[PDB]
């Protein structure tokens, strides 16, 4: 296997309570792994609850962990960090979080859409936190200039975290042309980069017309015009072109390159989607690693048997150069679940999926040596990093 899946899945809490849906359904994690604890924890994750049929619960939420497995809500935090929208006309989606070393703060992004045709379109929005508990607009951010001034005291390391206290990073008049924003600070060029998938005003059925665009920003707040990436995905094992759906990017210092796990597909839409790996020296020009999928749906009846969904990763360096560990928090869905018994996070059959649970949404984990993973992807039993 390119990655070894851990049995069961990880317990993320979801705030919603809805009789027609099983509890604690979640998707689209984004994990930050730090060298030293930030507000008590080395691992921080943003994620969204989600269920079939209604998207109103799909609101950025935060947890933290000492091990990347057992997640908790930090004391004093109340999820979600961005409120439930006032009606089903709107929904949130696609959270991604970065640690800003210069400000010692986390920056959590997400996508907000007006789903109504001929509506106002969508935005990528942003909440920042100093303390891990309060997520919003820094008190030293000036909304008139869009400058985040560095705090000069501990008392200036605060935010406003009310319902309206977010920054609009990007706006578009189309609904679905900035899906799954993923952000990295490029410490060579000294610029923030955001990649997103442009599905126009169409979305899930746009299919092979989809393409990834990148944008640049000096601060992570105000962004330039998009340009298309090149070579993002290649051919699968049948020689069929893959299209992007959702993605996560990291710069990996040990490999001297950007690395992306892409949730992608070869047919008309992301049903049955898989993960593929793709790399780049510059963030612009990519090359898929091999033809084989990094991760695929499990066997019929497993919690990940319909599709692999957006996934987040950390390359954990080893004691020698080029010999790290790929740690992957993957979301996925199980098909055909209405009224069916499904697994709990320990892999035991204790959860009754409900009437309107057409599918079940969960977050799990997979891992491998980077070298072993590359050997599988490349069909090269002797691959080692250069």
**Choice between 24 and 94, CB closer to Mn ion:** 94
CA distances from residue 253 to 59, 187, 220, 349 in whole angstroms, order as listed? 32, 10, 20, 42
**Choice between 261 and 289, CB closer to Ca ion:** 261
User: Does residue number 30 form part of the binding site for Ca ion (CB under 5 A)?
Assistant: yes
User: Does residue number 96 form part of the binding site for Ca ion (CB under 5 A)?
Assistant: yes
Q: Which listed option, Ca ion, Mn ion, none, makes contact with residue 154 (CB within 5 to 8 Å by class)?
A: none
Q: Which listed option, Ca ion, Mn ion, none, makes contact with residue 190 (CB within 5 to 8 Å by class)?
A: Ca ion
DSSP code string of 106-133: EEEEEEEEE-STTS--EEEEEEEESSSS
Q: Which residues neighbour 153 within 8 Å (Cβ) at sequence distance 6 or greater?
A: none
Distance from chain centroid for Cα 8: 20
For 102, the token pair is 């210069």
Site of interaction with Mn ion (CB under 5 A)? 93-94
Beta bridge partner(s), residue 263 = 246, 275
The minimum distance between CB 144 and Mn ion, in angstroms, equals: 32
**Choice between 94 and 248, CB closer to Mn ion:** 94
Contact 55, 88 (CB under 8 A): yes
The minimum distance between CB 122 and Mn ion, in angstroms, equals: 11
The minimum distance between CB 191 and Ca ion, in angstroms, equals: 10
Distance from chain centroid for Cα 29: 5
**Choice between 96 and 131, CB closer to Ca ion:** 96
Nearest residue to Mn ion by CB is 93
Give kind and range of the element (H or E) at residue 372.
helix 370-378
Contact 314, 31 (CB under 8 A): yes
CA-wise closest residue to 128 among 88, 167, 92, 102: 167
Contact 332, 312 (CB under 8 A): no
127 vs 217: CA distance, rounded Å: 16
Q: Which listed option, Ca ion, Mn ion, none, makes contact with residue 93 (CB within 5 to 8 Å by class)?
A: Mn ion
**Choice between 29 and 324, CB closer to Mn ion:** 29
Which x/- pattern over 114-153 shows residues binding Ca ion (rule: CB under 5 A)?
----------------------------------------
**Choice between 93 and 264, CB closer to Mn ion:** 93
User: Does residue number 24 form part of the binding site for Ca ion (CB under 5 A)?
Assistant: no
Nearest residue to Ca ion by CB is 187
124 vs 42: CA distance, rounded Å: 26
**Choice between 98 and 137, CB closer to Ca ion:** 98
Which parts of 237-266 interact with Ca ion (CB under 5 A)?
A: 248
Phi and psi, residue 155, nearest 5°: -65, -20
**Choice between 94 and 123, CB closer to Mn ion:** 94
Report the C-alpha dihedral over residues 111, 283, 294, 262, rounded to 10 degrees: 20
117 vs 107: CA distance, rounded Å: 30
Segment near Ca ion (CB under 5 A); pick from 150-158, 168-176, 188-196, 378-386 = 188-196
User: Does residue number 190 form part of the binding site for Ca ion (CB under 5 A)?
Assistant: yes
User: Does residue number 94 form part of the binding site for Ca ion (CB under 5 A)?
Assistant: no
64 vs 271: CA distance, rounded Å: 31
The minimum distance between CB 93 and Mn ion, in angstroms, equals: 4
**Choice between 334 and 368, CB closer to Mn ion:** 334
The pairing of strands 274-280 and 257-265 is: antiparallel
Q: Binder to Ca ion among 187, 218, 300, 379 (CB under 5 A)?
A: 187
The minimum distance between CB 111 and Mn ion, in angstroms, equals: 7
The 8-class DSSP code of residue 149 comes to P
The minimum distance between CB 187 and Ca ion, in angstroms, equals: 4
Which x/- pattern over 200-219 shows residues binding Ca ion (rule: CB under 5 A)?
--------------------
Contact 308, 274 (CB under 8 A): yes
For Ca ion, the binding residues (CB under 5 A) are: 30, 96, 187, 190, 248
């Amino acid at each position: 296997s390119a990655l070894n899946k851990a049995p069961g899945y990880q317990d993320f809490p979801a705030y919603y309570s809805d009789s027609a849906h099983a509890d604690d359904q979640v998707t689209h994690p984004d994990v930050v792994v730090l060298e030293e604890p930030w507000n008590g924890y080395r691992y921080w994750a943003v994620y969204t609850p989600n269920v079939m049929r209604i998207s109103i619960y799909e609101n950025p939420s935060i947890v933290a962990s000492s091990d990347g497995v057992h997640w908790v809500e930090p004391e004093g935090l109340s999820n979600p960090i961005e409120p439930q929208p006032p009606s089903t006309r709107y929904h949130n989606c696609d959270a991604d979080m970065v640690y800003n070393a210069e400000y010692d703060a986390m920056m959590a992004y997400w996508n907000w859409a007006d789903d109504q045709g001929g509506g106002v379109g969508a935005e990528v929005r942003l909440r920042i936190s100093y303390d891990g508990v309060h997520w919003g607009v820094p008190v030293t951010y000036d909304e008139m200039t869009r400058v985040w001034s560095k705090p000069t005291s501990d008392a200036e390391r605060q935010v406003a975290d009310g319902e309206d206290d977010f920054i609009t990073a990007i706006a578009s008049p189309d609904r679905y042309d900035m899906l799954s924003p993923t952000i990295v600070y490029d410490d060579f060029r000294d610029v923030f980069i955001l990649w997103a998938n442009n599905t126009g005003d169409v979305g899930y059925q746009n299919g092979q017309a989809n393409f990834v665009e990148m944008r640049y920003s000096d601060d992570g707040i105000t962004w330039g015009e998009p340009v298309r990436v090149n070579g993002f995905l290649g051919l699968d094992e049948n020689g069929q072109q893959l299209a992007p759906w959702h993605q996560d990017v990291q710069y990996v210092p040990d490999l001297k390159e950007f690395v992306c796990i892409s949730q992608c597909f070869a047919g008309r839409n992301p049903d049955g989607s898989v993960l593929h790996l793709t790399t780049s020296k510059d963030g612009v020009n990519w090359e898929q690693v091999g033809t084989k999928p990094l991760l695929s749906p499990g066997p019929d009846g497993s919690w990940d048997d319909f599709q692999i969904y957006r996934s987040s990763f950390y390359y954990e360096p080893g004691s020698s150069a080029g010999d790290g560990t790929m740690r992957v928090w993957y979301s996925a869905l199980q098909k055909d679940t209405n009224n069916k018994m499904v697994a709990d996070s320990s892999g035991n059959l204790t959860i009754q999926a409900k009437s309107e649970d057409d599918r079940i949404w969960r977050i799990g984990y997979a891992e491998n040596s980077f070298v072993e993973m590359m050997r599988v992807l490349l069909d090269d039993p002797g691959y080692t990093t250069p």
